[PDB]
Amino acid sequence: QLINTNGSWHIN
Amino acid sequence: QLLEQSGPSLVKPSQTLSLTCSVTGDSITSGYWNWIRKFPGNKLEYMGYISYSGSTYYNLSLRSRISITRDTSKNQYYLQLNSVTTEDTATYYCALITTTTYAMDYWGQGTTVTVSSASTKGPSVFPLAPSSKSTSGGTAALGCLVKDYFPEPVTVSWNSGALTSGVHTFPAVLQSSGLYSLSSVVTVPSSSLGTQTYICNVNHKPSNTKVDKKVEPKSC
Amino acid sequence: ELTLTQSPASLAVSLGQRATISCRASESVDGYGNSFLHWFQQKPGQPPKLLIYLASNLNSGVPARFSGSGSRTDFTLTIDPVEADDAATYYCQQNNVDPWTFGGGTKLEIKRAVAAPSVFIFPPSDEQLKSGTASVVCLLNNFYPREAKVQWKVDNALQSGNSQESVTEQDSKDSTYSLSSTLTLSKADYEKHKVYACEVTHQGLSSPVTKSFNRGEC
């Protein structure tokens, strides 16, 4: 369930 | 599920553009809430989002003069763009990204925004009457000339939306006066002209104007 | 910084054939086993519509004629078979590398049989004549291909600098285009003359067609 930060997606 | 858009369609240069997206269906405390804009022909530029948590992400080209905010009780979010110029003239779409697709999967209809010091002006609507100079076979063409309005856009429907088959609404032309002009036409059976009623509905939101024009046959 | 390059800018494909549009990223848009590249379709007066999410997944309510493939930097949208309803502009979008971008677009045109326009003409209304201006309007209905030529004649004299025109996007059903041209004269000028004519050249016509009316006559 990816989440996005400053343009990039990633887990947790 | 509906993303409704609100805001001014006309902004003066060096001033601030404020747009609103009202969401009905699910809460904005879920997903990512974005603004995108489409330039007059026809490039798309991503503007940015406010997340479910209230964190924002901006396109670096816009980081200087952009602000995206939200209101969770009203379930709305907003776009603020400062020091606006004629290069900010575009159509402004709001859109949602869910984690089901991780893509922009729901959109709003958009808000056409013109940057100008000129004031708005409602259209004059004149008939384009069917006659022996616009018939071929059992087919007659008729229309409406939507003349001298500002700014864009105008939308035309026929018989309140009942009549869609054979309807052509043309792109507007910018006249030398600086006012737009647009035609809309439709082909119908020529045998019906005497017994069937045809009305164009012209919507010009920028001037808060709606005009219904009934078009009748030309007989000498 | 990151650029998405679409190819070609415009593509002409016949009904029931295959269409392929490419999108190339300067850097990878992959992440966590996924390619963060998506395909949208936009028609005039409408928002973009999601066709393919994550490179190769079909959005719900989108026909199976649409498919997506590729990875890393090289991606491809495919329409097979292409239908009349598929006339639109197509965009790729990536959302995993700052800054987020779209491709420049690829317009898809349906190839079909040559069709000559039906030419129609409309005198100005009297109501507008009251304003001191006359708009005469020439309509070219349902023609293929797009390239058409419209010249105005007033009492058989060729006009220039006093008319404008626009063309619709391709029809979603019959794959034709339509054109509208407007001649604008002052009331005085319009009343000084008699024959108002629109001359049309198109591939579907053996010879140029001159569609006209006479002021005061049926």
UniProtKB/TrEMBL annotation, chain A:
Coiled coil residues, start to end: none
Subcellular location: Host endoplasmic reticulum membrane; Host lipid droplet; Virion membrane
Signal peptide (residue range): none
Protein name in UniProt: Genome polyprotein
Organism this protein belongs to: Hepacivirus hominis
Stretch of the intact protein here: 51 to 62 of 135
